[PDB]
Amino acid sequence: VPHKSSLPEGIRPGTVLRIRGLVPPNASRFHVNLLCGEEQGSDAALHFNPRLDTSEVVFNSKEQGSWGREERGPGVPFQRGQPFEVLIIASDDGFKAVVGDAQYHHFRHRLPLARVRLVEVGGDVQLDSVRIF
Amino acid sequence: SNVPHKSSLPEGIRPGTVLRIRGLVPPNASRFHVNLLCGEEQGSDAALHFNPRLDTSEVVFNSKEQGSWGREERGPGVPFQRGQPFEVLIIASDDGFKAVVGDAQYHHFRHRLPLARVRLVEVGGDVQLDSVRIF
Numbered sequence: 001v002p003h004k005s006s007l008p009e010g011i012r013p014g015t016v017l018r019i020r021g022l023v024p025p026n027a028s029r030f031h032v033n034l035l036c037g038e039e040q041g042s043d044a045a046l047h048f049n050p051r052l053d054t055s056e057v058v059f060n061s062k063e064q065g066s067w068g069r070e071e072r073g074p075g076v077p078f079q080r081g082q083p084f085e086v087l088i089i090a091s092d093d094g095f096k097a098v099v100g101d102a103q104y105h106h107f108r109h110r111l112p113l114a115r116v117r118l119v120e121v122g123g124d125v126q127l128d129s130v131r132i133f
Numbered sequence: 134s135n136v137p138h139k140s141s142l143p144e145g146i147r148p149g150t151v152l153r154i155r156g157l158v159p160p161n162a163s164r165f166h167v168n169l170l171c172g173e174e175q176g177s178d179a180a181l182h183f184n185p186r187l188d189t190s191e192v193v194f195n196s197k198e199q200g201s202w203g204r205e206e207r208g209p210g211v212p213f214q215r216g217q218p219f220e221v222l223i224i225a226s227d228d229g230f231k232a233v234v235g236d237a238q239y240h241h242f243r244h245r246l247p248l249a250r251v252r253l254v255e256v257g258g259d260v261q262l263d264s265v266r267i268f
């Protein structure tokens with residue numbers, strides 16, 4: 001079952017999501033979604049999707065049940081059996097995705113920041129904690 | 134053998150910027166500081182002066198503008214100890230700086246100077262820095 005956390009103050013520039021976890025001995029992939037509602041198929045302002053089995057990291061958004069243009073990151077800053085700490089940082093012009101001690105990708109806003117209400121973490125990952133700062 | 138830090142921020146900092154500071158407060162420590170400065174000159178204006186004072190058990194927040202300090206704000210107690218490592222997040226938002234210490238929200242410092250003026254991060258005083266990263 002995917003982990004879900006509400007954003008009680010919504011998200012604004014300055015909102016920081018810290019996700020600590022572990023990638024299982026062989027995970028295929030896992031994802032972090034920033035969702036605009038609790039209903040099934042709700043829009044995703046951000047879909048962050050490390051894929052171990054294809055060695056990619058896909059970024060996308062979704063509206064009206066339709067994915068958008070995929071953006072991909074440089075390499076795979078995740079490995080099976082190793083713990084991670086991801087920061088998702090909301091700025092005025094996009095989301096900064098930080099893995100470890102390095103800026104990994106910058107994803108420009110497609111949907112209004114204000115519509116975001118939910119963080120979802122699913123797929124093959126062992127979730128240690130989701131913290132919102 | 135204190136280990137300080139100076140980093141330039143040529144493009145400045147925008148709402149949604151994270152300064153992560155990790156280090157050790159050494160056994161004899163009196164105090165240390167994290168400054169967000171507007172220039173490289175001596176006594177530059179400061180959007181943020183963050184000042185854990187181990188010797189007085191206070192954490193002071195202030196700004197400096199046109200050469201004059203503002204009114205100090207104080208956080209709730211001192212989440213630092215001599216002989217112990219720490220992690221501080223200084224998070225810039227639309228309305229101010231959020232200080233996070235040891236994974237807990239600690240203080241919120243409303244902007245006094247425009248964020249666009251910040252040009253430099255300096256960390257010094259009685260601290261042995263592990264790392265300073267800006268995201």
Ligand SMILES: OC[C@H]1O[C@@H](S[C@@H]2O[C@H](CO)[C@H](O)[C@H](n3cc(-c4cccc(F)c4)nn3)[C@H]2O)[C@H](O)[C@@H](O)[C@H]1O
Nearest residue numbers: 031047048049058059060061062067068069070071072
């Ligand atoms: O956009 C995010 C979503 O991606 C899909 S998977 C997706 O399916 C697409 C079908 O048109 C393409 O096959 C796409 N694609 C494109 C490429 C591609 C194309 C050109 C160059 C190069 F390097 C790669 N490879 N795969 C693939 O990623 C997931 O099911 C969903 O959960 C979510 O992550």
